[PDB]
Design a protein around this ligand. Structure first.
Ligand code: 3UE
Ligand code: 3UE
Ligand code: ZN
Length: 988
């Protein structure tokens, strides 16, 4: 094993310019931590040796912006645009298609920037390490790359100098879109006001109104000050040998540098002598909600340095006990009181900054209740200090942590490096964050030695703490219009200030940029894997289907789950009256939360938290593999637990199926409003998903149901329900739904657990199935399709697809665009071609047109299992032009002007996605949900391998050409005059 070999490292070992400083076994995480420092530069290194073939690298820099230009964010984009060893244009995006990576990306936190990738191929790992090391340490930082990624002045027509100058840039629009999320606005201001004395007071990602203040020289200087290895933390994880990583890192990068003392320290925030208050504004919601019904207020407290790890562990658990779930004191005082709709953003513990902070409050407050909310926060703090916490809640909490520690995920390295970053950033010891057994033991010991331990902590940090911030936010109906006018003004000033020489240089550089964006260039300097590096076959999944409780099929899959059990049940929707369909998602979200039998909603929540890692239900439409107009509909019941709590888990499922408390009217109203609030808040962030779902709604029977379940129709339905004065007519629908769903008449189940736990599990499941009820479909055409377990699917053989174009009028500064095209299902031989084509179009055409030229944050094409080919954009400054580029993309595809190497790279990209690691808990789910056998997946795999140039041009013409297939279109974004005057567009 890797972690055992790492145990052979000794203190003082010299390896490729590094010295081993510490070797620590962490058996609760099955890993050995190795701490090293690079001798000449002093750069810190952490290697986590573990038997995991999905290896990860990251490099981290302490980046401390002193303004809101977004320079660290823009620099992060720009270093990926070309480097000394890989000077060609855009090494990073190109490597995405020359790799079998499981993850490739970068991001910018408030005061650090992190560059991680992961892969299961050791040669791929070396390739990516070289590209990453060169980008970060020796970037070209070309002026025009900065103009593309950051901001620039550009003529509306770059080759016409008589057209007006406008602002453009990828990050420019990226941040406009980020702050389309009003929770993100609140969150940004909270941090800026609470920590006003240094870097944390600015908008690290870039305030859109300040971004055009960034100059090329400021960008280069910021790299010089922060991208030195003495200011870096290097991280690797997995079973690939450490020696090779260290060799590259020293020889490629670190050997070129000497040690410095980086001018990058973040000083401590000096604590306030008295509390502060501030008021801010945000955008209106999408539903023209009255601003006096939409107030957010929160109260935040400054906490100690996160580098004091045990105190940080204490405060984190404390914050959870205060705010998590319907038994927490703040939930009870604030949420169940009906004072708001949900917690305010960043509720709980925030430890990404040098000093952590706790925050609590509400959104959805009527302005008149604001002073009551503030009062209740204070009163709740006083009560907790006096009474402390329930013992069984503390046990539930430690159980919750145990489940996190034991659960096996497929991206453990990515999770770990993100997790330790802020602590490491301020010279903390990341290894102490891995020693969870120690932290827990000391926490338990503190509780035992001092019965008022947590009460004392609450008094010290929440009652006596003068560094307290009250922040309130109210929507402004012209928030973004006001932003745009300020920008229009700023733009005008910039432009009128230009000399004739400036205007000429802006014109020439713009044409030079467009040229660089257009002219095909050689990428041979870049490393690459080959298609022959892709595995020919996949490891078979061993499962065992057992008919149980009579005729109910249960799928058993033995896996290394580390003492965890994962249970799923799938119950058909085929007998439910179709009028109840829209209410199934609501039914699903409250089913495990209203109480069951003798446990009221509070008792049930406590049991669920003490005995499980979660219990949920969700509605699903599962498209058939061979027929576009056939699907399966049902509800998925899902849960997980430790081995020893399996019986308790199934006891909960039994009571939930048999006696859910649908008379719980008051907690029901609370959940409805929480859900509606959260759905509305999530629209911008998933803007393109909402567009795609609307656009596909008229293309297949399933698409129509999917919009009902999770489209804008569903968000709107929840919003209406949440505003009703009498929710009784809705609540009375829940029993009608239970009648058709909560029984074993049309059910199948799955179990994932260790082989030695399987026997106990079969018993517990069979008992559950015998405890729920037993003894014709609403749709006239249903088909039985056996699995290579017989699924009963709906088919609508008279379904005819039709075209629709919908514009959702949204108070957004950017757009979200979707165009869906009906093409064949998964088992159709043309499907593999279309899948390759999607990635090809994305890489070769759409990314450049929509993002690089347009300045949209994202633009591409994808193909779903259902056979819907989707073209989309995300945070897009343009709507009509994007729709035009969708069309030109299909013309390009039809033209066949892509090479064999382009096709090979599209294959690499696609296989890097479909061969991504599956967790032990999820093995066999392709079979369970979609009825996809290994023989089907392998046939699909061979079709993907066989995809050729002539096949690609053929399917481009056959399905994507004009008039060949049915299209659907949708946009979320502000008013567009051209669209408003086109009668083929429905405005919503
Ligand atoms: C700094 C930070 C990091 C994380 C984080 O990455 N995770 C993921 C890992 N997870 C670890 C953990 C869970 C419970 C108790 C202690 C630590 C974790 C989970 C599983 C394995 C190893 C660590 C904590 C949350 C979340 C929030 C914050 N923060 O707000 O300050
Ligand atoms: C209670 C809880 C918390 C967290 C969590 O977010 N963190 C993030 C912060 N993290 C702190 C920490 C972990 C290990 C050792 C010491 C502290 C922490 C990590 C980095 C900076 C500041 C605090 C604790 C867990 C995740 C899950 C659970 N849970 O299981 O209910
Ligand atoms: Zn970005």
């Amino acid at each position: 094993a890797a972690c055992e070999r790492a145990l052979q490292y000794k203190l003082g070992d010299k390896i490729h310019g590094f010295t081993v400083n510490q070797v620590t076994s962490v058996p609760e995480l099955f890993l050995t931590a190795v701490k090293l420092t690079h001798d000449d530069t002093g750069a810190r290194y952490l290697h986590l040796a573990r038997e995991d073939t999905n290896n990860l690298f990251s490099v981290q820099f302490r980046t401390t912006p002193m303004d809101s230009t977004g320079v660290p964010h823009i620099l992060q984009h720009t270093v990926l645009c070309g480097s000394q060893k890989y000077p060609c244009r855009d090494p990073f995006f190109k490597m995405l298609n020359r790799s079998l990576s499981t993850f490739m990306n970068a991001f910018t936190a408030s005061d650090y920037t992190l560059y991680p990738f992961s892969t299961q191929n050791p040669k791929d790992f070396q390739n990516l390490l070289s590209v990453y090391l060169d980008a970060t340490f020796f970037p070209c930082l070309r002026e025009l790359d900065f103009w593309q990624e950051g901001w620039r002045l550009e003529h509306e027509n770059p080759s016409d100098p008589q057209t007006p100058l406008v602002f453009k840039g990828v990050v420019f629009n990226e941040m406009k879109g980020a702050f389309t999320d009003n929770e993100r606005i609140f969150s940004q201001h909270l941090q800026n006001r609470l920590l006003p004395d240094h870097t944390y007071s600015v908008v690290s990602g870039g305030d859109p109104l300040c971004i055009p203040e960034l100059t090329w020289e400021q960008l280069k200087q910021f790299h010089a000050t922060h991208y030195h290895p003495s200011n870096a933390r290097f991280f690797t994880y997995g079973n690939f040998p450490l020696e090779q990583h260290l060799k590259q890192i020293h020889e490629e990068a670190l050997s070129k540098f000497q040690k410095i003392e980086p001018s990058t320290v973040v000083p401590a925030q000096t604590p306030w002598d008295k509390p502060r208050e501030f008021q801010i504004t945000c955008g209106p919601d999408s539903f023209a909600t009255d601003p006096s019904k939409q107030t957010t207020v929160s109260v935040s407290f400054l906490l100690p340095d996160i580098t004091d790890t045990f105190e940080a562990f204490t405060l984190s658990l404390l914050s959870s006990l205060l705010t998590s779930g319907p038994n927490s004191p703040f939930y009870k005082a604030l949420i169940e009181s009906g004072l708001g709709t949900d917690f305010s953003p960043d509720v709980g513990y925030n430890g990404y900054t040098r000093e952590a902070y706790f925050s609590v409050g509400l959104q959805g407050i009527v302005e008149k209740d604001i002073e009551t909310v503030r009062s209740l926060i204070d009163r709740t703090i006083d009560e907790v200090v006096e009474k402390g916490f329930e013992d069984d809640r503390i046990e539930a909490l430690l159980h919750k942590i145990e489940i996190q520690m034991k659960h096996q995920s497929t991206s453990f390295g990515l999770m770990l490096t993100s997790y330790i970053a802020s602590c490491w950033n301020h010279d903390g010891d990341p290894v102490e964050l891995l020693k969870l057994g120690n932290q827990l033991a000391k926490f338990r010991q503190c509780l035992q030695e001092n019965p008022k331990f947590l009460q004392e902590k609450v008094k010290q940090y929440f009652k006596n703490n003068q560094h307290k911030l009250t922040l309130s936010m109210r929507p402004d109906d012209k928030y973004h219009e006001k932003q745009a006018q300020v920008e229009a003004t700023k733009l005008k000033q910039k432009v009128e200030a230009l000399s004739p020489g400036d205007r000429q240089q802006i014109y020439e550089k713009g044409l030079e940029l467009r040229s660089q964006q257009s002219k095909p260039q050689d990428a041979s300097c870049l490393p690459a894997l080959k298609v022959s590096d892709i595995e020919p076959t996949i490891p078979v999944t061993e499962l065992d289907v057992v008919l149980t409780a009579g005729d109910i099929p249960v799928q058993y899959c033995a896996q290394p789950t580390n003492g965890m059990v994962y249970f799923r049940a799938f119950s058909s929707l085929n007998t439910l009256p179709e009028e109840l369909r829209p209410y199934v998602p609501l039914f699903c979200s409250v089913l495990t939360k209203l109480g069951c039998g003798l446990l009221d909603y509070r008792e049930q929540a406590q049991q669920i938290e003490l005995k499980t890692g979660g219990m949920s239900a969700s509605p699903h439409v599962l498209p058939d593999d061979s027929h576009m107009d056939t699907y399966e509909q049902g509800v998925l019941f899902s849960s997980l637990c430790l081995d020893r709590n399996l019986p308790d888990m199934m006891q909960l499922w039994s009571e939930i199926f048999n006696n859910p408390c649908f008379e719980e009217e008051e907690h029901f109203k609370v959940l409805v409003k929480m859900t509606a609030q959260e759905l509305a808040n999530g629209i911008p962030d998933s803007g393109h998903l909402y567009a795609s779902i609307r656009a596909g709604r008229t293309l297949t029977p399933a698409g129509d149901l999917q919009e009902t379940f999770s489209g804008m129709d569903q968000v709107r339905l929840m919003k209406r329900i949440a505003e009703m004065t009498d929710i009784k007519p809705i609540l009375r629908k829940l029993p009608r739904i239970k009648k058709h769903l909560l029984n074993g008449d049309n059910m199948r189940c799955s179990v994932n657990a260790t082989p030695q736990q399987m026997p106990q599990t079969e018993k517990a499941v069979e008992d559950f199935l015998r405890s729920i009820g037993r003894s014709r479909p609403v749709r006239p055409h249903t088909v039985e399709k056996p699995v290579p377990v017989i699924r009963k699917l709906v088919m609508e053989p008279t379904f005819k697809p039709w075209q629709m174009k919908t514009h959702f009028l949204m108070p957004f500064p950017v757009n979200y665009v979707g165009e869906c095209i009906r093409t064949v299902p998964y088992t159709d031989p043309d499907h593999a071609s279309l899948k390759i084509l999607a990635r090809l179009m994305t890489a070769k055409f759409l990314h450049t047109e929509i993002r690089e030229k347009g300045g949209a944050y994202g633009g591409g094409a994808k193909l779903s299992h259902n056979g819907i080919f989707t073209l989309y954009s995300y945070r897009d400054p343009n709507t009509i032009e994007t729709l035009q580029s969708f069309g030109k993309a299909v013309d390009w595809a039809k033209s066949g002007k892509f090479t064999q190497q382009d096709i090979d790279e599209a294959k690499l990209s696609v296989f890097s996605t479909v061969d991504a690691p599956v967790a032990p808990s999820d093995k066999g789910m392709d079979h369970f949900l979609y009825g996809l056998s290994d023989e089907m997946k392998q046939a699909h795999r061979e079709q993907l391998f066989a995809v050729s140039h002539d096949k690609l041009l053929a399917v481009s013409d056959r399905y994507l050409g004009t008039g060949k297939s049915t299209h659907g279109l949708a946009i979320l974004g502000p008013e567009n005059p051209k669209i408003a005057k086109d009668p083929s567009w429905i405005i919503r």
